[PDB]
Amino acid sequence: GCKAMYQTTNNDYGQPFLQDNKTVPTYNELVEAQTEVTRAEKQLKNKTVATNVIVPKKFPLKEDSYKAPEPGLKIGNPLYMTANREYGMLKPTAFEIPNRFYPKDNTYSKSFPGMHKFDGLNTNITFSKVHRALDE
Amino acid sequence: MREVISIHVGQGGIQVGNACWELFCLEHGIQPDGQMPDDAFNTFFSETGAGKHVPRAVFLDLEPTVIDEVRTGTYRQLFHPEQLISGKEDAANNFARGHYTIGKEIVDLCLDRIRKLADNCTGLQGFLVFNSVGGGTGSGLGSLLLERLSVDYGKKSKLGFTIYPSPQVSTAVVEPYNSILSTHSLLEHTDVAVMLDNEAIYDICRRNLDIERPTYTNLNRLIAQVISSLTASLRFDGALNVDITEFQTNLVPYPRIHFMLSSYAPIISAEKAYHEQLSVAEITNSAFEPANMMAKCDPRHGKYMACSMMYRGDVVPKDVNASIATIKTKRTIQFVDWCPTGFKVGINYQPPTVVPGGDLAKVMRAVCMISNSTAIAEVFSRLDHKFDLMYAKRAFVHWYVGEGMEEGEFSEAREDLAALEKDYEEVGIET
Amino acid sequence: MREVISIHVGQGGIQVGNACWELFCLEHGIQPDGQMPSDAFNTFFSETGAGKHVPRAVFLDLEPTVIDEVRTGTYRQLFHPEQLISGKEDAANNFARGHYTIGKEIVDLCLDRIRKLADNCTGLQGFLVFNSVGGGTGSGLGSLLLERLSVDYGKKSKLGFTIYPSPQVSTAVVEPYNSILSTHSLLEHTDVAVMLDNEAIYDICRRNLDIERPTYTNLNRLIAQVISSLTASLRFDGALNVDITEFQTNLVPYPRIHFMLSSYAPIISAEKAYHEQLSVAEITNSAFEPANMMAKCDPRHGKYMACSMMYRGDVVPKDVNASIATIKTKRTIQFVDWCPTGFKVGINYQPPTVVPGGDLAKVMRAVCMISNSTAIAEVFSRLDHKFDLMYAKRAFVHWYVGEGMEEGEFSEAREDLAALEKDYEEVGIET
Amino acid sequence: QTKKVEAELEENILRKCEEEKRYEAEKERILNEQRMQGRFVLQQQMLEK
Amino acid sequence: MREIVHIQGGQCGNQIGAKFWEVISDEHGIDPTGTYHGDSDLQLERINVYYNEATGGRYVPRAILMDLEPGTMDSVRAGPFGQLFRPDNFVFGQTGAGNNWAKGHYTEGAELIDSVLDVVRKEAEGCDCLQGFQITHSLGGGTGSGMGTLLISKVREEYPDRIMETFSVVPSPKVSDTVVEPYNATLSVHQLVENADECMVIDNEALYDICFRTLKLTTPTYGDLNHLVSAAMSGVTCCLRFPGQLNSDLRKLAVNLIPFPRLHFFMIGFAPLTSRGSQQYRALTVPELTQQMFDAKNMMCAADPRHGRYLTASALFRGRMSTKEVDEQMLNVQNKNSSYFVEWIPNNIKSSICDIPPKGLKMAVTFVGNSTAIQEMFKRVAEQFTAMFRRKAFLHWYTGEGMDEMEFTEAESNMNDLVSEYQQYQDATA
């Protein structure tokens, strides 16, 4: 919503004379101003709108927050301790948790329904091959 | 869009099934309860859209006792309630029962479930199968599970970690019979399989963990360790990646020869791990140590065909590249003529997660190798001798005739081994 | 400004209306006392000016016990005191008794109440008649009632829920006779009636709800949910709304065939409800799964004429056509040649309200399907034969002939069956 | 050039809000999670009562 | 004007692709976010070559990242300077190739390669006057070798008068990476020699000798590795984008490096490179650049370049240095080592000068030599490749994707002839 968008045709018509009649620079200086003037053309849009090693991330689970769950069945005494379960009986400690992580992320891969095939009609124009000036 | 769906059939699988998850669970910030207390768990667990992470596993077993352990165990909340299909009568080590009488009316249920799992994960890479060959159930249902799958969908790649009987130690007395018959089913339906003899681990158990009284609970953990290495590159970041679809394309010289035996290192308990620098060069050699082999063999008795070994940890391309440099020259490791370059190298940065309550002492480097060498024939030729001994007088043959199998089934199977046995000799002859 | 009137009789009407009214009251926040604790409610209740709110329903029945339970139960204050027209003697499963003998002395009272009830309303769209067919309890009253309503009102649409007897499980022993006559009455007097045979639920209940000992109270709850799903579009905001009158213009291919069969999903218990995403993608397929059909009939054995299945919840409209497209491709699934498209898709937002103490577990998404499939002939065929078996030697016929029925009625009723079967066969053939 | 500064920002300023709009859903998906998190906890024990 | 469109193919090239744009990005002074902050007036004279223009004055590279697996693509953005790439040009598959050529050249590559076919026409067309194409790929991988070769094949089919270049990494037998390296690599070049205008050979092994001999860095890494070429790639286009005494366009170099149509495998290298500890010590002058440019170890291929001779080679001297000195030393070398240089093509080195050096150094040179040494590379690749086939080892795979043994047969022949046709000039005399 910029006021600078509604400028319609018929308004470019004569708007006085931007420079005054008393401060016209002589030809000599103008020959020297080209370098500065051109740069503004290239970077003015550039100045306004334009503006290593692998590192690991922290492991998702915090050591202090294991929250070990109790078994569903009610074992009474150590006698019936069956080896088939002694898996996961020990909660992780600080030593066990790995020190570094190197994730693989495909958030940029889980997209792109398919690659594009543009079924258009030419529309590229031919510029001629040598000394653009003889090209229609 | 990359995952792995696990199929386990047989009591040995279920017990091994638990072992794998404890190693997997702790490496990705998941507590026992299954409730979380960026996207790195997509390969194994399928997001529900709100709440729990679901294991992508299916457990099959025809006996309820072992399953009865899981559904009231510490991992009670984890697995989905309606995916642990179970039977009512145990096969009783009879391979026939799992292939002609009882398996028929439970095969469907497994078939019905499987299609649902592929309905959610988008880019299923392959199916991992862990089974005990030397059992009536595990050999039976596990065998049929491969038959439909090979035809159910098509050219999907599959992996299987079998458990063949030990040379001088065995549990049952019928393992030689059913195991040989099992080979035929597995020879023409799976791209890759790994020898997993029990005896070796104990010997690996004796020196390294310094535990003189190991139990299967200790046994299971190490196997689950290999699972981390082979599929490690799927869900992490590294300087060079490897994928399942790129394994059976580079470790199979010919379509028939598809038995490669694994070896894992190192194994040094925390009681003494702190007196060796754990240099990469020393570890690299340690893997190829003849006796240490995870399997029932002395590769000094044969050549090598293809060694695709994957490193993990803080490995560097120089630390590995020089290491392979020294290995090639040695006299005690000889390569076949027609593969002058015979290694595939990977890299994964994740330090090897150490399970609590275990034995492994955490180190900054690790290596797991999967190499298919001609020396595999020893078990096949060796196992043949026991099979020859019994069938001669038709001992124990009487019941397999009682489960509906025709007698001719036995005769056909043996011929396959010799052809497989013969082929191994042929490819091994230098040109 | 839009209204609908509810009519119930005996077994079906009474004990389906109970549950449907608890569901409606729970959804709208109308407590059992009728006082609203501090505009969508209009379509099922009328203003009392101050305090309570009286549902627009009229309960009709001949046997006092079931109705009498309503006047003294926890919902005693709810229904209008003088709308519970109660009989004095029971019909005793006799269609003739409930249609020519004792029904006359109650139709006069039943109609006048209907007249007064219709008077207050201003936006009458249609009548929801939940009547019992196989239950001689009410069939006789039900058959006559619709007949009078037709000539009395005219173009106003009518909807009925008949619960036919299961192919194998049945309660009465004279059911085959009573239903066949009732079908004749509904034939030229009803517009939309849905198959809801009890057998499927018994199969449905133990399949999903996880209650090995289901009962009637379990059975009724499910029917109530269906009605709420059908009607919510009328009484709550919706992007693509469908009203009561926009069914018979979209599911009745011809004036003759005016029967359809429904089905509902998902159904799952909270004990295992949320181990999955319950993605809108999967729910659509299940609704068409033959194993969940709301009626004991197999759609695989027949074609499809038109399916107007309704969504409810927060279903993204785009996914709606995303899921449907897959349905068409799939393959004793196919639609008749002359049906280019038989789908009426409408989306409503409000999530279904789940009553505490029930079995159904709420979710963010749901769907109720109403598809008419040619397989409907099976229920008629099986019942058509059964009538033949008994009538072969006039079993029980003397009792019906003794209540004023003309012996020629049965033959003309039988001729009705063949006409419907022949019409179905002719319409099921391709061009 | 002095003219082109404003409109070239026009896209920039008009597009930051959408980044906030992407935040709109960010707040959004709390609805089910807060819906499933607590409200279901009671229902799980409701069968227990 | 005379701009190029960069097209990467394969995981290897992507890693090179990132640093090259990363390395090239610094030279002009384009910040990571896309906001220019350059200092020199010269730094923006010819920005058109590697940067477009859109709303806001931002700049986006004219690159298309093509790979059949997502894993490399995901990580490629997250690093520095990754936001330069336009999201709308990425193309990626959902199956993968598994280092098997056939899956990536006849079954899967073609279907998805249309998209990369679609985009490439877009990028090339926009520029005022196209100057040519450059493509990087890893012949050691099954996927790129098939899709990458196909894209090259179509491009020549679509724009005859442009020029296509290739930076090639060919497996060295000493250091192995892929059990199927002998199979694919030898096969792929068969199409490469026919259509590709220029192919630059760089060996992984040589990459490593420079680090452990001259650079003297303790723990080399791909980032150390990939950087080397990126600067090397920086030099090849350095003269094209800035002023110079004798501007040397992309074809300018081609004009003096291809004696015959089928000899289009040059090999280049970058320098100088002095140990960090000693860098404070070596003398920096025009001559010194020559010791490390013709040096055996500084040139980045496995074959020792002294076992044959030079058919034609020239160096693009960059920086401010007296032009008499550059010529005099050039004829200086060509005088007293005649044995290594053929005799029927006199004065067989070209000269080039540019006035802007990379940031941090005064004078350096980039060398591109067509040395007869390259005969060794194919032989070892040929030697192993020939050996594997006789037994039909690992032949069922490629036979399972519409291929035949016949296709395998023909390609082996072309290498043998190609190698033969290259060594002939070694013994040729006038």
Ligand SMILES: Nc1nc2c(ncn2[C@@H]2O[C@H](COP(=O)(O)OP(=O)(O)OP(=O)(O)O)[C@@H](O)[C@H]2O)c(=O)[nH]1
């Ligand atoms: N290493 C190891 N192997 C085991 C373990 N438990 C079972 N096994 C294997 O399983 C075999 C025992 O028979 P199983 O195949 O497990 O019996 P099952 O799985 O119930 O199948 P059926 O015998 O047919 O009922 C042993 O020979 C072992 O090889 C274990 O804890 N560790």
Ligand SMILES: Nc1nc2c(ncn2[C@@H]2O[C@H](COP(=O)(O)OP(=O)(O)OP(=O)(O)O)[C@@H](O)[C@H]2O)c(=O)[nH]1
């Ligand atoms: N679903 C349901 N079924 C019922 C109910 N009450 C009785 N039934 C049984 O459902 C069967 C068929 O249902 P109906 O159409 O209601 O037949 P009916 O009116 O009950 O005929 P009667 O058995 O004489 O009462 C009957 O044989 C009853 O045994 C009820 O409240 N709900």
Ligand SMILES: Nc1nc2c(ncn2[C@@H]2O[C@H](COP(=O)(O)OP(=O)(O)OP(=O)(O)O)[C@@H](O)[C@H]2O)c(=O)[nH]1
């Ligand atoms: N004396 C002198 N001669 C120059 C100088 N620069 C270029 N030349 C002459 O230019 C010849 C080579 O051609 P270039 O000037 O590089 O340009 P060109 O002839 O158009 O060739 P291309 O543009 O590269 O196709 C040399 O043989 C020189 O004689 C210079 O600074 N001093």
Ligand SMILES: Nc1nc2c(ncn2[C@@H]2O[C@H](COP(=O)(O)OP(=O)(O)O)[C@@H](O)[C@H]2O)c(=O)[nH]1
């Ligand atoms: N220059 C360079 N080459 C590499 C690097 N990593 C791997 N390679 C080579 O690339 C080959 C594998 O190519 P790859 O990345 O798989 O390409 P892809 O087949 O398209 O996935 C291996 O043989 C390696 O020798 C690296 O960091 N730099």
Ligand SMILES: [Mg+2]
């Ligand atoms: Mg067992």
Ligand SMILES: [Mg+2]
């Ligand atoms: Mg009754």
Ligand SMILES: [Mg+2]
């Ligand atoms: Mg010139």
